[PDB]
């Protein structure tokens, strides 16, 4: 041996001392709080409501506006005679193109 | 409201049900199973009525109920298309699938899981209906991938088994070429025509082109086992029977037809693609149908014979007839199942024991599933009044008075002629003659649960095709007028199939041994292409994957051109540097040096 | 249904032919009508009578956003930070209306072909040219953008685009 | 932003002073409290961005990026206090400090408005993670990965800040809105090749491209669990999102500049599944998956068009998920035998069937099975390359195919078959573990029913 | 007692209060970049009667 060195100490079993546990601490009462929070918190909290607020988060993206906006141009244009979709984005007359 | 939509959703939402319920004190007792299949029932009937809807006005409807999501100009909606081939093909589906889950509830009694396969069994049966009812490709597409993921956990059902788990791995692989096939379609259609559902595909594919309709086919060989991606499903026969019975054979390998006939406008404007339809399904039921005259194994018999009734099937697409391969697969589905069934049944009497070699003796040892048997082998081979009459026989004319590949007809006419020597082959060698099973004769075939489910899908078989070949509306033109000689081609071909084949098997109970021939050794061992396809093309990418990519590449060269090459210059330059003697002289020396090259070269 | 607006998503009036039945025997899916009524019909439109009767005490209004007009891009002077962002977020807004109109043209033609069925080819043909039409309008307008468009470019292919059709009226003049 | 970027710089002080054996339960509670404020960033526009003030903004690209982030964090803790049990009181709240500190840095660079100040937090993260490996690290080969991993990303950003520095110079200003509003033609020129370059090839190395990737399976097989965990799913989308970013001022020159890159990507995207196919070691065969898929990634962002950039945005949050929860699943196994090679365990199913299952579900999400968001992103990518050109879908076919293959392979050679006779310590899982895998797989599900809050600003 | 657990659990409100301040802090970055408010050419229009400025 070229050291004083510790023998590799055996794996320790959380089962032994504590047959029903969560895995989360070696004291029985911090592991079930640790488990309690956790599931608490991050299930019911953060998956239920998170999953239900983003359901229902106001619709800023304009998706249903647009809709409405597209179905008002169509009935006038439609009405008019007009072609539904212009061939021009911005208006030629306020273009000024090189001579 | 009309109880069309209604009806259709309630079929499939009472189908999602009991997976819902897995979750329960009832997933957790033994009453599961007869759970399911008393659900599969109900949805059964109520998938019938709207079956009566449209036999007497052909209603047919489109329900985009729920809106997915908008890419721009491309809006994703869930869609489910309730039209003719979705309402004939679920109540023939549910009813298969009721009677596999009895017969599963008696076949897989002693399982320590058989609530975890019924609940496979019904996600697969899911799966299937929304690749059916699908109205866009996205949704075609999630059916698909989950229908072959199913297939691949109820292959591998046995975990400790290697072959099986082999069995598992090749059928994804084989299926993910087929799905190359299917995305490179999804693309080409999304790219060129805005739209992922079949209304604005078909209206605005007037003419498709090669490229989609080859991207079609290509998915439909891969999930439908044509030739080339064939070996997939007879190696598929390592799940339990009641898998093979229901999965494959009967309504998943009709993925890639049902696939081909929902594209049937773009298919009729294209004719290249026509044309290779017709040549693939050709060779694919003429080379299954070759390889299954001579196979020991009575579920690779029956696998093959799914193949060449698949290839029949990819036959009568090529010749512009799409309704004729749907009423096909109808028919195929009664009599395919009801056969597999029988088979189960002859394998559990007899211990686990699924070669033909050791069966014998079962025509009186077990009548029920001897007549059974016998009636689903007739209407396999087309007996004049069967319900695999209504479909093989108008296939064959049409195949005979179309201008057709001659080589594709020749070997159709063949494959017939071999499917009657097949199921002469099964028949013989099991039920007839004097029985080489092992003394302790464990024969029961007295199960209710076996009997009823046979009863039913047997009672299919016989009046099923009259009834639904009545009641549909006629729609192709019918060859009224042909020489008699070529009305009867099936008839003659099968039975000299029939009497060929059974002057060769009464040729084997002589004294007289003979070595096997080159012709038998390439049918029996399935034309070699198992052996060379999996063991040269495999070796040669797992070779590749490790002596170029992992270890020249990553391990060796792109080691040594950045990182090494750059540690050892500095390495280097850092030893000269520092290779100092700590000499005034010398560093001095080179302050000279440094001032003279300073005075002149600096200005 | 007073639900959408029947100019913007037309449907043909629908033409049920009367039934003549010519058996005495009873009709299943008559009798199955009449029991799916019974069953099914009669429970849901109670269960909504009693919603929109619960609705109807509690009414409230929601509005649609109306957005005025603002100076373009064309009008903003070169690197005019404030009439930049106006006009740009105008285009994206107006980028966006493009694009459903475009949907709703896809929602007739497919809605057509449906209720067509086996003669669309040629019942469906005005539902056809005009999505072509909208269809090369928009290509026209957003075609080869990129992933980071903008006002500014879509002017400047729009230029390049004048300038193309102004050249080649001089060479058909010429 | 400040409301969420304070109460993690007062997650450090709680955990200074929390007692010794309620690090682990406070550090967790408040990591999911502010997970769960930044749910409120998912709310965005479809004009323009959410300009906070001069210094933060978010967009629709930023914003599942800190989600993603703040949700990563508490599961880190998780593993973290699985396999650090012996440790110190000390140790144990450096570990957490270094922890929290990259989570700092992550937020403020995805949500800094500079491309100096995002330089400055996106190299900032590098000295948290390099002492995580080379401090926590199991074996011998730490020190060695940690050096590969910081001159790696050190040579290939120094340009980038020189690059940064003479833009700034240049244009006057660094700031996102006014470059994008302000940008102008890169005329086709040696000067403006090697500008390109320079911006292309931090980025490249920080994604990885192929050829400069092998810092990843070297610092992704040696870090410890939570290192291994951050080094996947958010350090490899800081590339993606700085690709995205800073190709405004790189047109037109991205269309000829962008063919080697590509070629390196479908190329080494097929290289890499195949080295996968053949890996004695399971956390180096994670590792090689993630590299072919950020490989899809790249070939995404260079081809840059509204469907392609969609496509990589919804890959990336896919792959952070997938990739995390699979090196979990890893970590577990080796917490049991010891042992990173894969053969070694065997039967798993048999010896615990819930990890079985969790197992089945990470390995049918890291292939493309729809409707998963792992597919539609994939999906979208190989429709825009589609576009691009048509024999990109014979290479992205392939790479689908031996994806599928390489998966199962891992989980039947795991899982199935007949357990190792001499492994006789496989305990039960634990409920913490269990746990673990069920907040990485949930999420995924339930941004597969909502996918339009992960496909970006081009939605 | 009493005391231990306040002793103990005084640092769970750390959190809380950070995000509070956050928020302060938000609303003071807000309240800096109020040079164009009722002035955008999309969105000006007439003060009511009983409002002073129209965000904050
Ligand atoms: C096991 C189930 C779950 C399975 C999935 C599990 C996994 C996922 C979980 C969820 C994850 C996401 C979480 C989202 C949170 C937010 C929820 C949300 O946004 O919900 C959306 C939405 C709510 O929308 P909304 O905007 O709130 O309301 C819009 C309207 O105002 C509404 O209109 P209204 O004003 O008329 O309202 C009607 C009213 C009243 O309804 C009725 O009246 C209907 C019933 C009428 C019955 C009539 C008969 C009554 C009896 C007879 C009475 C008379 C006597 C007669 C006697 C006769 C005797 C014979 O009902 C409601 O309002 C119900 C709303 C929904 C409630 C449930 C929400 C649960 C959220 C829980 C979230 C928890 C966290 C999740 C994540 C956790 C981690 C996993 O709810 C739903 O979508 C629920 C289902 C919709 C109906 C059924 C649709 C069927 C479709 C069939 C398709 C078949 C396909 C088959 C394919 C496969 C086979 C091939
Ligand atoms: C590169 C070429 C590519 C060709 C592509 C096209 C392929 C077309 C295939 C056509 C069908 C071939 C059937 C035989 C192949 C498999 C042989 C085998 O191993 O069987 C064992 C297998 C029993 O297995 P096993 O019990 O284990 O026996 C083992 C023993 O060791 C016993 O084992 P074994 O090996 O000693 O027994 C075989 C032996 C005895 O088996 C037979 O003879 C089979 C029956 C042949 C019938 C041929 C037609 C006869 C006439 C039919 C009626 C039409 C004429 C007109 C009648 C009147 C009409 C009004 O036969 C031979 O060795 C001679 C060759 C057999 C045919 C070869 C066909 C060409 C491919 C090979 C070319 C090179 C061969 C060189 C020689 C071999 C190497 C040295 O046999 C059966 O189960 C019976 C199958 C054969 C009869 C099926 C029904 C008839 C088939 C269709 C005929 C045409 C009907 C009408 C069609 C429509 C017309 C419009
Ligand atoms: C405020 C919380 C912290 C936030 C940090 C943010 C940045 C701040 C930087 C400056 C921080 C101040 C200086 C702290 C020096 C601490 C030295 C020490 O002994 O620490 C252990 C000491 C307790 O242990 P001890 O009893 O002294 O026993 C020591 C033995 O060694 C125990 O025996 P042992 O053998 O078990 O211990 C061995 C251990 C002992 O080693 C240590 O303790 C050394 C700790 C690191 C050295 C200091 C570095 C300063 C330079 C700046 C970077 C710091 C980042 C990390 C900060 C760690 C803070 C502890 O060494 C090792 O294990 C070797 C590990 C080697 C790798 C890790 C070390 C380097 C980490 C830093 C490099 C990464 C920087 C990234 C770039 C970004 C920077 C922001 O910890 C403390 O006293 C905690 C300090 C903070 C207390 C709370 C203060 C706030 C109170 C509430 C305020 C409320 C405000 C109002 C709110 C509104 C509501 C009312
Ligand atoms: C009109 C202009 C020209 C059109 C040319 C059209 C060419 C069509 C054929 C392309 C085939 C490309 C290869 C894909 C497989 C066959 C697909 C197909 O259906 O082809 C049509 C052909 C038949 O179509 P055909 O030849 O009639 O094509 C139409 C011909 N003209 C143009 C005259 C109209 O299909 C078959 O014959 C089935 C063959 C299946 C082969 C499967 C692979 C086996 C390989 C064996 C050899 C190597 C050893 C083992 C390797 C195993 C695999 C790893
Ligand atoms: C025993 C179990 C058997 C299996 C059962 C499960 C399998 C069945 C799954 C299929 C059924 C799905 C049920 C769908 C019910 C409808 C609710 C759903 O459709 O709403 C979704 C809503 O989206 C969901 O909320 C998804 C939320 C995504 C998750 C948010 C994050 C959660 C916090 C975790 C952080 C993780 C961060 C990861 C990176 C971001 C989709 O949007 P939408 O239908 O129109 O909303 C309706 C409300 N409207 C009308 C007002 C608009
Ligand atoms: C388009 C993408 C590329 C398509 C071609 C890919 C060819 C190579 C495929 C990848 C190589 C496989 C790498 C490693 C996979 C593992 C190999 C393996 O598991 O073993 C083989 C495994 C099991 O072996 P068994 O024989 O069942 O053993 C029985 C036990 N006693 O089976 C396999 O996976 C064999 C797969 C071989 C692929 C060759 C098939 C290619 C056929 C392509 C023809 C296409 C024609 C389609 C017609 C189209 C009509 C238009
Ligand atoms: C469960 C039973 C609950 C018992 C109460 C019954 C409720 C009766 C009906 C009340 C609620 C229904 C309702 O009104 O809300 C509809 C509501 C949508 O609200 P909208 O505002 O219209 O949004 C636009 C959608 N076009 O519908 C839904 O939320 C979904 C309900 C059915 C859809 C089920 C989705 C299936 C999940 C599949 C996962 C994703 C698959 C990918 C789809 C692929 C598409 C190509
Ligand atoms: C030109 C002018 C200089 C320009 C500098 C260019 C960039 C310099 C790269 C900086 C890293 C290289 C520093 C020198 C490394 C070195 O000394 O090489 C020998 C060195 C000695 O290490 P020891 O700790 O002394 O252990 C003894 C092992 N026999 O060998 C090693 O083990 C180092 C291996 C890892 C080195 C760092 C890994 C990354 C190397 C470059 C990658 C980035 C290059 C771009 C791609
Ligand atoms: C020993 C030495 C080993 C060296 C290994 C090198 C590996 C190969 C890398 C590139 C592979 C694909 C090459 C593609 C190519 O040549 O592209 C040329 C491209 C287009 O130019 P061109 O066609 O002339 O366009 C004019 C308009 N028609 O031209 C351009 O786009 C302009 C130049 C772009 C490239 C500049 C340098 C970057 C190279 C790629 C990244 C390098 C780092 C990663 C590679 C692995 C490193 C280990």
């Known amino acids: 041996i070229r050291l004083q060195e510790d023998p590799d100490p055996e794996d320790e079993n959380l089962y032994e001392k504590n047959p029903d546990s969560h895995g989360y601490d070696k004291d029985p009462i911090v592991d079930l709080w640790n488990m309690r929070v956790v599931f608490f918190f991050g299930f019911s909290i953060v998956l239920v409501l998170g999953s239900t607020f983003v359901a229902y988060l106001p619709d800023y993206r304009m998706q249903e506006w647009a809709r409405r906006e597209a179905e008002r141009l169509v009935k006038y244009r439609e009405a008019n005679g007009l072609p539904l979709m212009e061939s021009n984005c911005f208006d030629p007359n306020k273009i000024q193109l090189p001579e | 409201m009309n109880p069309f939509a209604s009806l259709t959703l309630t079929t499939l939402t009472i189908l999602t049900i009991p997976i819902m319920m897995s979750n329960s004190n009832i997933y957790k007792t033994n009453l599961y199973p007869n759970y399911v299949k008393t659900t599969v029932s109900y949805a059964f009937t109520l998938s019938l009525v709207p079956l009566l809807m449209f036999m007497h006005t052909g209603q047919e409807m489109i329900i985009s109920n729920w809106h997915w999501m908008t890419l721009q100009t491309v809006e994703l909606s869930l869609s489910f298309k309730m039209d003719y081939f979705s309402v004939m093909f679920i109540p023939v589906a549910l009813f298969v699938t009721w009677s596999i889950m009895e017969f599963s509830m008696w076949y897989m009694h002693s399982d320590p899981f058989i609530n975890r396969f019924f609940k496979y069994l019904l996600l697969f049966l899911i799966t299937m209906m929304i690749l059916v009812t699908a109205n866009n490709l996205f949704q075609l597409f999630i059916g698909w991938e989950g229908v072959g993921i199913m297939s691949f956990l109820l292959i591998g059902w046995w975990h400790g088994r290697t072959d099986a788990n082999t069995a598992a791995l090749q059928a994804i692989l084989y299926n993910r070429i087929g799905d190359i096939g299917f995305v490179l379609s999804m693309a080409w259609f999304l790219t060129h025509s805005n739209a992922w559902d079949l209304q604005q595909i078909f209206m605005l594919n007037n003419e498709c082109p090669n490229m989609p309709l080859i991207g079609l086919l290509l998915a439909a060989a891969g999930k439908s086992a044509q030739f080339g991606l064939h070996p997939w499903l007879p190696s598929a026969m390592e799940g339990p029977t009641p898998v093979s019975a229901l999965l494959h054979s009967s309504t998943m390998v009709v993925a890639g037809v049902f696939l081909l006939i929902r594209f049937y406008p773009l298919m009729e404007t294209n004719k290249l693609v026509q044309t290779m339809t017709l040549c693939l399904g050709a060779i694919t039921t003429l080379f299954t149908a070759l390889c299954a005259i001579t196979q020991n194994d009575i579920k690779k018999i029956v696998a093959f014979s799914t193949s060449s009734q698949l290839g029949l099937m990819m036959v009568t697409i090529g010749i512009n007839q799409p309704h004729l391969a749907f009423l096909h697969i109808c028919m195929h589905a009664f009599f395919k199942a009801m056969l597999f069934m029988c088979s189960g049944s002859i394998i559990h009497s007899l211990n686990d024991e699924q070669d033909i070699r050791k069966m014998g003796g079962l025509y009186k040892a077990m009548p029920f599933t001897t007549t059974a048997l016998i009636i689903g082998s007739l209407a396999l081979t087309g007996m004049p009044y069967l319900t695999g009459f209504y479909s093989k026989d108008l296939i064959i004319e049409a195949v005979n008075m179309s201008y057709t590949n001659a080589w594709a007809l020749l070997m159709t006419l063949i494959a017939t002629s071999l499917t009657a020597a097949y199921s002469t082959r099964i028949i013989f060698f099991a039920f007839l003659g004097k029985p080489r099973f092992p003394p302790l004769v464990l024969i029961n075939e007295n199960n209710p649960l076996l009997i009823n489910s046979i009863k039913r899908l047997l009672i299919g078989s016989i009046f099923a095709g009259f009834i639904i070949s009545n009641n549909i509306p006629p729609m192709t033109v019918p060859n009224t007028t042909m020489p008699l000689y070529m009305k009867m081609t099936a008839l003659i071909v099968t039975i000299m199939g029939f009497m060929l084949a059974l002057e060769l098997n009464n040729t084997t109970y002589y004294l007289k041994f003979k070595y096997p021939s080159q012709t038998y050794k390439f049918s029996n061992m399935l034309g070699y292409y198992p052996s060379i396809m999996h063991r040269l093309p495999t070796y040669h990418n797992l070779s590749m994957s490790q002596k170029s990519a992992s270890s020249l590449l990553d391990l060796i060269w792109l080691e040594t051109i950045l990182p090494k090459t750059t540690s050892f210059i500095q390495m280097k330059m850092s030893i000269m540097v520092s290779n100092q003697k700590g000499l005034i002289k010398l560093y001095f020396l080179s302050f000279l040096i440094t001032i003279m090259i300073s005075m002149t070269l600096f200005n | 249904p007073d639900s959408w607006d029947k100019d913007v998503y037309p449907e043909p009036p629908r033409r049920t032919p009367a039934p003549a039945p010519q058996t005495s025997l009873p009709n299943p899916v008559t009798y199955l009508t009449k029991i799916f009524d019974l069953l099914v019909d009669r429970p849901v439109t109670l269960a909504r009578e009693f919603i929109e009767q619960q609705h109807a005490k509690n009414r409230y209004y929601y509005y649609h956003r109306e957005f005025r007009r603002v100076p373009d891009i064309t009008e903003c002077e070169e690197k005019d930070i404030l009439c930049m962002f106006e006009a740009e977020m105008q285009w994206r807004r107006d980028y966006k209306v493009d694009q459903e109109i475009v949907n709703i043209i896809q929602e007739r033609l497919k809605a057509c072909q449906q209720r067509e069925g086996e003669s669309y080819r040629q019942n469906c043909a005005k539902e056809l040219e005009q999505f072509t039409q909208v269809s090369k309008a928009f290509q026209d307008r957003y075609s080869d953008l990129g992933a980071h468009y903008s006002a500014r470019k879509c002017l400047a292919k729009q230029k390049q685009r004048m300038l193309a059709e102004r050249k080649a009226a001089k060479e058909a003049a010429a | 932003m400040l409301k969420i970027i304070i109460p993690t710089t007062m997650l450090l002080p709680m955990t200074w002073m929390s007692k010794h054996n309620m690090i682990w339960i406070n550090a967790t509670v408040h990591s999911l409290l502010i997970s769960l404020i930044s749910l409120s960033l998912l709310n965005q526009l479809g004009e323009n961005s959410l300009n906070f003030s001069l210094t933060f903004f978010s967009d629709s690209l930023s914003a599942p990026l800190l989600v993603l982030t703040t949700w990563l964090l508490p599961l880190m803790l998780m593993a973290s206090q699985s396999h650090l049990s012996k440790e110190t009181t000390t140790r144990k709240k450096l570990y957490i400090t270094m922890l929290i500190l990259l989570q700092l840095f992550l937020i403020m660079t995805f949500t800094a408005t500079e491309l100096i100040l995002f330089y400055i937090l996106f190299e900032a993260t590098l000295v948290p993670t390099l002492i995580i490996i080379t401090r926590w690290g199991n074996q011998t080969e730490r020190l060695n990965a940690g050096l590969y991993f910081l001159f790696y990303t050190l040579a290939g950003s120094l340009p980038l800040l020189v690059a940064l520095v003479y833009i700034q110079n240049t244009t006057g200003s660094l700031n996102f809105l006014i470059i994008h509003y302000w940008s102008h033609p890169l005329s086709n020129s040696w000067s403006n090749i090697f500008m390109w370059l320079a911006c292309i090839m931090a980025f490249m190395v920080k994604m990885p491209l192929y050829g400069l990737h092998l810092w990843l399976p070297k610092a992704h097989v040696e870090a410890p669990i939570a290192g291994s965990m951050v080094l996947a799913a958010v350090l490899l989308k800081l590339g993606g999102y700085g690709m995205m970013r800073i190709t405004t001022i790189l047109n037109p020159l991205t269309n000829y500049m962008a063919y080697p890159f590509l070629m390196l990507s479908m190329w080494g995207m097929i290289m890499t599944s195949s080295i996968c196919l053949r890996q004695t070691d399971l956390k180096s065969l994670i590792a090689y998956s993630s590299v072919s898929h950020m490989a899809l990634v790249i070939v995404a962002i260079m081809i840059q068009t509204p469907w392609s950039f969609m496509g990589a945005t919804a890959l990336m949050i896919a792959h952070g998920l997938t990739s995390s929860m699979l090196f979990c699943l890893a970590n577990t196994n080796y917490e049991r035998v010891h042992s990173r090679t894969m053969i070694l365990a065997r039967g798993l199913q048999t010896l615990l069937p819930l990890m079985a299952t969790w197992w089945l579900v990470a390995s049918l999400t890291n292939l493309a099975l729809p409707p998963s968001i792992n597919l539609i992103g994939e999906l979208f990518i190989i429709t825009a390359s589609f576009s691009w050109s048509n024999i990109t879908i014979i290479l992205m076919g392939m790479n689908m195919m031996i994806t599928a293959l390489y998966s199962l392979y891992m989980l039947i050679t795991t899982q199935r078959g007949k357990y190792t006779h001499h492994i006789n310590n496989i305990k039960p899982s634990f409920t913490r573990e269990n746990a673990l895998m069920a907040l990485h797989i949930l999420p995924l599900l339930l941004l597969t029913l909502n996918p339009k809050m992960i496909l970006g600003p081009l939605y | ?56």
């Open chain 5, 1 to 56: 007692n009493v005391l231990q657990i306040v002793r103990d659990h005084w640092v769970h409100i750390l959190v809380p209060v950070g995000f509070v301040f956050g928020c302060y802090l938000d609303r003071r970055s807000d309240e800096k970049l109020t040079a164009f408010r009722n002035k955008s050419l999309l969105f000006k229009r007439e003060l009511r009667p009983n409002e002073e400025v129209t965000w904050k």
